[PDB]
Amino acid sequence: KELSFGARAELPRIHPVASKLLRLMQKKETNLCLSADVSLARELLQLADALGPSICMLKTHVDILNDFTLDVMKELITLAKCHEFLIFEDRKFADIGNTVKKQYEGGIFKIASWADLVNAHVVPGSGVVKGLQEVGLPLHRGCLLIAEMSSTGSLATGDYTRAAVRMAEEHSEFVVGFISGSRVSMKPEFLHLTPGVQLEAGGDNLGQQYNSPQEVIGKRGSDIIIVGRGIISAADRLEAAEMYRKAAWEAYLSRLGV
């Protein structure tokens, strides 16, 4: 059998951040990551508080926050601890190792000081991971590698996707899984998180493509759905989050045998 999230949390080679995430997914019956794509701190924090019980993870783009300060992120941490979710900065690092370490630790945002997870593109080669890990390992953080993208014309296919998987294997002390559209690794230690998710068929006018939670989790074998506009643009964002949570959770149970 495929192992439950709770059993995967105990695997010998599991990363501590992956284990914490898997435990809380199991406890809370949620494999939903909220993509909190808003430009105001007040809305970010109001969403994190109201939707915290429904999510395993809150994904940020702090570079879109108009009123970012480090005190906003301290508050977000308080909510993350209160409601039990991880914070994932969706920074999609994509430069040489020497540069991404600086971008991860420093500047105004100090990402590594508050983000449990970040992600990186594999296009620069494995130095991108080596650079991030210089900062992230001492801070006990984890990283996801972008093995596939949800957008039209994505070049993250075929051998590129295979290279991402190898790179994750080779840096398993820091890399905890993937951003992908589907299961890309057979090794249950790795998490699969999938953006490009809505209940209805469609896309946007700038290349985004959507697939349903049942497709993504149930048929394609991914672990967590990442949902932005499907929730954020809804009138009642709490009920929307609950719809997405129930869809992804039941897809997971049905794949497990439950």
Ligand X SMILES: *c1cc(=O)[nH]c(=O)n1[C@@H]1O[C@H](COP(=O)(O)O)[C@@H](O)[C@H]1F
**Is residue 45 involved in binding a copy of itself (CB under 8 A)?**
no
Distance CA 117, CA 6 (A): 20
The residue from 152, 202, 219, 233 that contacts a copy of itself (CB under 8 A) is: 152
Q: Which of 20, 92, 110, 130 is catalytic?
A: 92
Distance CA 258, CA 250 (A): 9
**Is residue 2 involved in binding a copy of itself (CB under 8 A)?**
no
DSSP state of 234: S
Question: Minimal distance in Å, beta carbon 249 to ligand X?
Answer: 18
CA 189 → CA 92, 175, 194, distances in Å?
22, 10, 16
Q: Which of these, 192, 195, 137, lies nearest to 164 by C-alpha position?
A: 192
Distance CA 243, CA 224 (A): 14
Distance CA 54, CA 33 (A): 9
DSSP, collapsed to helix, strand or coil, labels residue 211 as strand
Helices (H), 52-195: 70-83, 97-105, 127-136, 158-170
Question: Minimal distance in Å, beta carbon 239 to a copy of itself?
Answer: 23
26 binds, among a copy of itself, ligand X, none (CB under 5 to 8 A by kind): none
The residue from 131, 230, 245, 251 that contacts ligand X (CB under 6 A) is: 230
**Is residue 12 involved in binding a copy of itself (CB under 8 A)?**
no
Contact 43, 73 (CB under 8 A): no
207 binds, among ligand X, a copy of itself, none (CB under 5 to 8 A by kind): a copy of itself
Query: x/- contact string, 147-186, with ligand X (CB under 6 A)?
Result: --xx----------------------------x-------
Question: Minimal distance in Å, beta carbon 27 to ligand X?
Answer: 25
CA 192 → CA 10, 64, 143, 181, distances in Å?
17, 25, 12, 8
Residues acting as catalytic residues? 90, 92, 95
- Give the residue numbers of the binding site for orotidine 5'-phosphate: 35, 59, 92, 95, 99, 150, 208-210, 228-229
- The residues binding a copy of itself (CB under 8 A) are 37, 39, 61-66, 68, 90, 92, 94-99, 101-103, 106-109, 121-128, 130-131, 134, 146, 149-156, 160, 163, 204, 206-208
